Structure formats: C-alpha cells, structure tokens
C-alpha cells in the first residue's frame, strides 16, 4: 500500500529584544537566509532542491514536504524541515540586521493564538464526501491519544489550569467547513489537488498537532492513511458517529487519564482509546481480507505499532514516555511538579511546554531527550541530512528537486504542478507541467536528467513527451 501525502508545518517565531522586528520580517529572514521562486500563476517563497516549499504564511515561516508515498518518508522529509528551519535561523543571525530568531515546531502561544500543521492525502475523487466525513470525525476526535503533543493550560485562552493531550483541540468549533484560521472545522473541505481534479481529491487535514516524536508523526500519517483506504473501499459498515463531536474532542483532550467516555449514536460508551481500538481492528480485517499475508512490511509495522501503542495507553500511558510527545512532555512536567511542589499554574511548566518544541539541538527539550537517548527514533540523522537536499525518488518531487539542483540558474519558477524554465536565447518561458504526482519520478526521468548537460537539452528532450514523462 502507498498513498501520496505531504505535511505542512507553520513554525512559531520569536525575536526577543529587537524593537524593529515584526513577524513578517522575521519569517522572511528565515526563508530568505536559507535560499527558485514559486509559480502562483509577494512574500518570500522558495522551492528547495529536495522538492519542498519554504515560505512565509500568515506571518509564520512554513515548510511543506515534497510529495511522498508512505509515512516513513513523510517522517523523514518532515524532520528534514526541522533541520532546515534551525539552519535558516542560524543563517539569519548573519544578516546585517543580526537578529537572534527562535523557532518552535508547535501550534499555540497558550494565549489564544493557534497555527497549523496540515496533513495532505491524495484520494479517489469518486469516494463520496459524506462517508469521508462520517468515518473520519470519530477517528480525528480520538487519535490525539497518540498524536497529541501536550499542552499546559485549558481553554483556548489558557485560563483553565491543568494539562491536556493536544494543543489544537480547544481551537475547533464546528464539524465541517472551509475555515483554517477561525471557527475551525474537524473536517476541512478545501479540495485543491494540484493534479487532475477529475481523478483526485486532496484531503486537507488541519486538526493535528505538530509532533517532534518520529513515532508520533509516523502513527499520525500511517494510521490515517489506513483509515482512508477503508473509507475509499466502503469497508466500514459500523456507525462510529458520536454525540457532540466538537465537545467530545475537547473533553478527550482535557482528560489525560484517558477515561472520558464518548457517547456513540448507536448507544455504545467507549473511551477514546477503545474507539481507536475499533478502527485498528477494522484495519487489521481490511488488510487480511485484501492481501492475506502478502501485506507490505510498512503496513504491517503501522498496524503493529498502532496496536502496541493503544494497548500500552490502556495499561499505563507513562510507559510510552520514549514514544509519544504528550507523554514525554508530561513526564518532565510531573517530574518538576514532584521535585519543586509546583501547581499547574506555575510559569516554569509553561516554559517546558513551549521549549519542548524549540528547533535548536542545544536548547530544545525534545532535542535534549534525543541527545541523552531518552527518545525512540524511526530514521537516522544521516538520512535526515540527505533529505534536506535530495528529493524522494518515487514522486514528481524527484523531477522538481533535481531540476533545481542541476539547472537552478535556468529555473524561472516552480510549483507542485509545474517547472518553468528560462532558456538562453528565448523570449518565452518554457512551462513543463508535472500534473501526475506519481510520474516525473526517478524511474521516469532519472536517466534523461543524467544525460542532459543543459536545461535547453532537457526541454528539447521533453518536448512532445509530456504524456510520457509527466502525465
């Protein structure tokens, strides 16, 4: 099983003791200090040689992975984004302005502002949206039991005291809608696949916290992809719908003892962990029914880790302190509460909540846990460093990233669905559409790119071959 997917992360940005600084200028310094331009057809907005987008969005620097086909690669190129952000801030410190810029891979300032970590999944256009909604809402209400990054403060304005599973939960207000910045919906309806809209839907998911833990990001993307396969195939016969799902999202988040019971329309009363176990059981039956034991290793691994995590959550969540963000964070928080007799209103607990997500290797608390061997990893650092500058081989990001690496000077602009060349001795720009996400791969264009010594040679060889290499 594969599925085209990508992750967009808006980073928190802080520039203390700089009265000239504003969020837009600081975000631009980050984007510009790291590094062709984006093809909208005015903010700092670049495509990287790994096929990712790095740009200023809503006064935050944002990193959007290249298109990938599986959740391990999603983790890998998303983690590369953290390294890119850290390096970009270090390079911005060398700009004439000399600002010390701090970046946070989180989702709130604990004072009423939230910013987004969006997941994108490619789906069949034919899948009816009412089934997408009714099967995903209960899954999204409950997957925070392993996806949550943890938060100190209850309520969007942070005025209630205590710890909760997720940063995003208090900001959601409706079940379905177009919004992403206010009155946020559990299911966002925007459908912009940057691909053939007769074939594909792009599902745009906005409810997840950004995760530091690679295991959490892996489960977030991998379990969702399995549930989408069941929805596409019409496999789910049960009704998982719950009463008052927005209220249930908040109540689940606000109970880190994991005992709150959802009230299902069919009469059942299940905790969030129990409802997740129902989705896991169906996913196991789905994979057995479709493939037998001919299951690909990554699908088997996602199922095994999903089940193991849910079993441990129902047994004792604190045994997952090396795997899940909210557990790792809560373990530090409770350590200080015990050592220093701190109430939940203590400012030191707020600082731990935020600094956990600092991208600096020397100062971010998640990064310190990794350095001390107190966090389980999924990928190794050498591969993360390579993914900062090399694209995935099995999507159209391959063509995009390799063109920029090899012919960057002659790339006028690029986007998810095109690369635009500026060739010497030509008054017109050459737009190469890359409309299919699973074409333009190394298997399609790698040898061609190897043997072309100039962008003029490449565009010549691609001419009239659009319906071979890219669609």
């Amino acid at each position: 099983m594969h599925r085209v997917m990508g992750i967009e992360t808006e980073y928190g940005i802080s520039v203390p003791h700089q009265p000239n600084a504003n969020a837009m200028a600081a975000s631009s310094q980050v984007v510009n200090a790291y590094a062709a331009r984006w093809d909208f057809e005015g903010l700092a907005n670049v495509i990287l040689t790994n096929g990712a987008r790095l740009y200023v969005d809503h006064a935050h620097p944002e990193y959007s992975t290249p298109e990938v086909t599986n959740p391990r690669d999603a983790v890998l190129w998303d983690k590369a984004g953290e390294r890119i952000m850290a390096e970009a801030a270090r390079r911005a410190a060398d700009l004439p302005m000399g600002w010390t810029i701090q970046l946070y891979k989180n989702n709130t300032d604990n004072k009423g502002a939230s910013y987004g970590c969006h997941e994108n999944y490619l789906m069949n256009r034919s899948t009816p949206f009412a089934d997408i909604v009714r099967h995903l809402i209960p899954f999204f209400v409950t997957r925070q039991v392993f996806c949550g990054a943890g938060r100190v403060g209850i309520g969007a304005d942070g005025r209630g005291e205590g710890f909760q599973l997720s940063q995003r939960a208090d900001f959601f207000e409706v079940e379905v809608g177009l919004e992403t910045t206010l009155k946020r919906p559990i299911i966002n309806t925007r459908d912009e696949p940057h691909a053939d809209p007769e074939k594909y839907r792009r599902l745009h998911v906005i409810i997840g916290d950004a995760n530091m833990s690679e295991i959490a990001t892996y489960l977030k993307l991998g379990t969702t992809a399995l549930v989408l396969a069941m929805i596409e195939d019409g496999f789910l016969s049960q009704d998982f719908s719950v009463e008052s799902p927005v209220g249930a999202l908040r109540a689940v988040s606000h109970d880190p003892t994991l005992r709150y019971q959802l009230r299902l329309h069919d009469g059942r009363r299940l905790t969030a962990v129990q409802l997740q176990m129902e989705y896991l059981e169906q996913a196991r039956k789905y994979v057995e029914d479709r493939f037998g034991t001919d299951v690909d290793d990554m699908t088997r691994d996602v199922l095994d880790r999903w089940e193991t995590t849910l079993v441990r959550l129902a047994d004792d969540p604190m045994q997952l302190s090396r795997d899940l963000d909210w557990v790792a964070k809560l373990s530090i928080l409770e350590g200080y509460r015990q050592r220093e007799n701190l109430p939940w209103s203590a400012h030191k607990l707020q600082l731990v909540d935020l600094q956990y997500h600092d991208v600096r290797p020397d100062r971010g608390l998640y990064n310190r846990l990794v350095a001390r061997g107190r966090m389980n990893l999924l990928v190794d650092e050498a591969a993360v460093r390579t993914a900062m500058h090399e694209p995935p081989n099995d999507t159209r990001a391959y063509f995009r990233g390799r063109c920029l690496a090899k012919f960057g000077a002659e790339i006028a602009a690029a986007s998810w669905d095109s690369v635009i060349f500026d060739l010497p001795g030509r008054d017109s720009l050459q737009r190469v559409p890359t409309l299919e996400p699973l074409r333009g791969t190394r298997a399609h264009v790698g040898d061609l790119l190897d043997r072309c010594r100039s962008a003029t040679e490449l565009v010549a060889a691609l001419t009239g071959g659009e319906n071979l290499y890219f669609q």
Partner: peptide
C-alpha cells in the same frame, strides 16, 4: 532524575518574562 538536571541546564532564562512575551500571530 538525571534528565531534569539536563533540562534545568538549558531552560530559557527569565522564565516568567519569556512565557509572557511568547505571543504569536494566528495562523492556520
């Protein structure tokens, strides 16, 4: 434990001022 000492070594200075001044623009 050992890890709370490592965290204490790296926490931002002026913790109450740092938390109060962490104010972000809304995003998506």
């Amino acid at each position: 434990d050992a890890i709370l000492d490592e965290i204490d070594d790296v926490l931002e200075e002026n913790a109450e001022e740092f938390v109060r001044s962490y104010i972000q623009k809304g995003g998506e």
